[PDB]
Structure 1
Amino acid sequence: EPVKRDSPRRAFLMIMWGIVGGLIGAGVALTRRCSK
């Protein structure tokens, strides 16, 4: 019997999607500097 699930491995998904969400989040904050 497997010790742990092979998917969807929440921890791996949180970091990958958080980093992607962080990258676009940086762009949103980046693009508002010259808007003022």
Structure 2
Amino acid sequence: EPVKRDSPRRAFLMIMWGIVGGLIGAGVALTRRCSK
């Protein structure tokens, strides 16, 4: 019997989605600097 599930490996999904969200949020914040 396996001890851990192969999918959806919550930790990896959290890390990847958080990194993507942080990157796109940083891009949005950068684009808003010249909007003022």
- Range class of TM-score, shorter chain: over 0.9
Ranges in structure 1 where 5+ consecutive residues have no aligned partner: none
Question: Which structure has the highest helix share of the two?
Answer: 2
What is the aligned residue count?
A: 36
Shift of 1:20: 0.6
TM-score (norm 2): 0.93
Q: CA deviation at 1:26?
A: 0.3
Cα distance between partner residues in 2 of 1:25 and 1:35: 15
Runs of 4+ residues over 3 Å off in structure 1:
none
State the identity %. Answer: 100
Cα deviation per residue 1:1-36 (whole Å; 9 max; x = unaligned)?
000000001100000011011110001111000010
- Structure 2: runs of 5 or more not aligned: none
Show the counterpart of 1:25.
25
